[PDB]
Amino acid sequence: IESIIKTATDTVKSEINAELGVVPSLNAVETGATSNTEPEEAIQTRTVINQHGVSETLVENFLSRAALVSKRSFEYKKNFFKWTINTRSFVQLRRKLELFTYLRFDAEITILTTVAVNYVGLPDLTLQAMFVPTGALTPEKQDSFHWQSGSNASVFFKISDPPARITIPFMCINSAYSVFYDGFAGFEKNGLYGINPADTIGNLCVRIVNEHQPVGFTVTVRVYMKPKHIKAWAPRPPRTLPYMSIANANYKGKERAPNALNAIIGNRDSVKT
């Protein structure tokens, strides 16, 4: 049953056995169960005290790293940055979230920015990141009136400073995020497969505050995300074939034996090699 495990288990001394009516090594996997043959009952062992800690394979250690979610470069001479939030854009963060079905965490977002004026040096600049939820009106110009909003959460930072960090709580209307969704989105007969409306967060708009001067720029924005306080349910098998798009889970397969469609593991000469 439920028990607190701090380190790995240990082995106790084994004697010879010639018992009738008892077979440890036989079982039946047709029941759906997993084998329970202790090594004490298959070979002759000694007694070994074990000090190996298992604290690194936790779920909160396996997940909580800073991974890139967005990268986009805009020139300044649509003059700003707008990104509808998803976690399906980069394939190395994605495959680690595809292991579970439900997730419940608190993110921690870092906006890192660098510039390259195209006098090759540069004066100081000032940025603005604004978190527009769903429903609210998004700007469409650098100096639109939607940037004067006191209600949307904004943050100002400079190029010369350490990067900006905030934290965002658990935002869903259910009790967990659905990584997978086997349903439709609308009440009509023809909607969009594979998305739920219970997981849509909104936009994130980034501009640069300084007025265009004599010289044009090139601004490159990176956004990182680190989960915190993670709870996870229902593990799943990992994705093997490469991804093809974002809105679904299509598959194409590579042409030659590693990760092909009819072969995941590359070929061998014969079985008795």
Partner 1 sequence: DRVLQLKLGNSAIVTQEAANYCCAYGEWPNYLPDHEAVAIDKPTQPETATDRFYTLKSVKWETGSTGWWWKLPDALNNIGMFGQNVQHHYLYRSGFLIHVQCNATKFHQGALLVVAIPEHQRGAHNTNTSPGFDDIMKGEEGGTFNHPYVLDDGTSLACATIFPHQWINLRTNNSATIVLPWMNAAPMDFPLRHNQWTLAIIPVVPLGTRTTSSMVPITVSIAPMCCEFNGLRHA
Partner 2 sequence: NQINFYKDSYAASASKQDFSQDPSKFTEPVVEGL
Partner 3 sequence: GVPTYLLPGSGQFLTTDDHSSAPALPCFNPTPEMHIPGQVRNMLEVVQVESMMEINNTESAVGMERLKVDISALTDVDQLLFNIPLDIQLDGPLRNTLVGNISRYYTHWSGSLEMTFMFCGSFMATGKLILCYTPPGGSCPTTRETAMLGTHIVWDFGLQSSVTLIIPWISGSHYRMFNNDAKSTNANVGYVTCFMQTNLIVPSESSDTCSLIGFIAAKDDFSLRLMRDSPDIGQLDHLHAAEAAYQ
Site residues, partner 2 (CB under 8 A): 1-6, 27, 31-34, 36, 55, 58, 60-61, 64, 106, 167, 169-170, 228-229, 235
180 contact, one of partner 3, partner 1, its own copies, none, CB 5-8 Å limit per kind: partner 1
Answer yes or no: are the C-beta atoms of 263 and 256 closer than 8 Å.
Answer: no
Cβ nearer to its own copies, comparing 112 with 195: 112
Answer yes or no: are the C-beta atoms of 94 and 243 closer than 8 Å.
Answer: yes
Q: Three-state SS for 131? A: strand
End-to-end CA distance of the chain: 44
Distance CA 95, CA 100 (A): 10
Nearest to 53 by CA among 23, 84, 9: 9
Distance CA 127, CA 129 (A): 7
CB of 116 to partner 3, least distance (A): 19
CB of 75 to partner 3, least distance (A): 14
- Other beta carbons within 10 angstroms of residue 223's beta carbon come to 20
Amino acid at 246: I
114 contact, one of its own copies, partner 3, partner 2, none, CB 5-8 Å limit per kind: its own copies
Strand partners, 224: 68, 110
Q: Would you tell me which residues interact with partner 1 (CB under 8 A)?
A: 28-33, 98, 101-102, 172, 174-178, 180-184, 187, 189-194, 198, 234-241, 243-245, 247-252, 261-262, 264
CB of 270 to partner 2, least distance (A): 35
| DSSP letter assigned to residue 260 | B
Q: Would you tell me which residues interact with its own copies (CB under 8 A)?
A: 65-68, 90, 92-93, 96, 112, 114, 116-124, 126, 145, 148-151, 154, 156, 159-160, 209-211, 213-215, 218, 220
Which tokens is 176 given?
A: 């967990």
CB of 63 to partner 1, least distance (A): 18
CB of 208 to its own copies, least distance (A): 10
262 contact, one of partner 2, its own copies, partner 3, none, CB 5-8 Å limit per kind: partner 3
216 contact, one of partner 3, its own copies, partner 1, none, CB 5-8 Å limit per kind: none
6 contact, one of partner 3, partner 2, its own copies, none, CB 5-8 Å limit per kind: partner 2
Answer yes or no: are the C-beta atoms of 223 and 110 closer than 8 Å.
Answer: yes
Would you state the torsion angle of the CA atoms of residues 12, 16, 21, 24, taken in this order, to the nearest 10 degrees?
A: 40
